[PDB]
């Protein structure tokens, strides 16, 4: 019954986790498909509110100044659709959207054919391992 007593300190820490949510409590409650928030209540031009979805498509020509003070509202602002860069307030941008990616760890394979691979593997080592050793050359 580990998970039973793990929530004892977690529910008490959930309020501490909610303390970070206490910044923006509006609109109920980093990889993203397209940048989406609710109304972006926080936000020349001062405030910056842009959303791309089936309702209320927004666009702004200016930017690169601090309205929001880092994350705001729906927390998703940044690279989507391309064409769209929010950089200055600590962006969650250029992040993998919904997709199918195969990522594994430690593909361990021993030596198989060294017969003709003596100097042939060295050409493979000059691809990856070479810039990771002496880049000054």
């Amino acid at each position: 019954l580990k998970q039973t007593e793990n929530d004892l300190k977690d529910i008490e820490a959930r309020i501490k986790e909610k303390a970070g949510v206490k910044e923006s409590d509006t609109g109920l409650a980093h990889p993203l498909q397209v940048a989406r928030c609710t109304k972006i209540i926080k936000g020349e031009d001062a405030k910056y509110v842009i959303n791309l979805k089936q309702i209320a498509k927004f666009v702004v020509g200016l930017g690169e100044r601090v309205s929001p003070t880092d994350i705001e509202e729906g927390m998703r602002v940044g690279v989507d659709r391309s064409k769209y860069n929010i950089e200055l307030p600590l962006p969650p941008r250029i992040d993998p959207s919904v997709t199918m990616m195969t990522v594994e760890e430690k593909p361990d394979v021993t030596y198989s054919d060294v017969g003709g691979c003596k100097d042939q593997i060295e050409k493979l080592r000059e691809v990856v391992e070479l810039p990771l050793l002496s880049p000054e050359r």
Partner: protein
């Protein structure tokens, strides 16, 4: 001749009445003018 005495004082006192009224009525407009609004598209001139 003597009209310009009280006319210049009246026209100068209306600076906040006329010109600044553009930005005086924006007290409740600016909050709506803030980007958190709903955009639109003009389909007719």
């Amino acid at each position: 001749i003597r009209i310009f005495r009280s006319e210049l004082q009246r026209l100068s006192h209306e600076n906040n009445v006329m010109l600044e009224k553009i930005k005086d009525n924006k007290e409740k407009i600016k909050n709506n003018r803030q980007l958190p609004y709903l955009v639109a598209n003009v389909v007719e001139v």
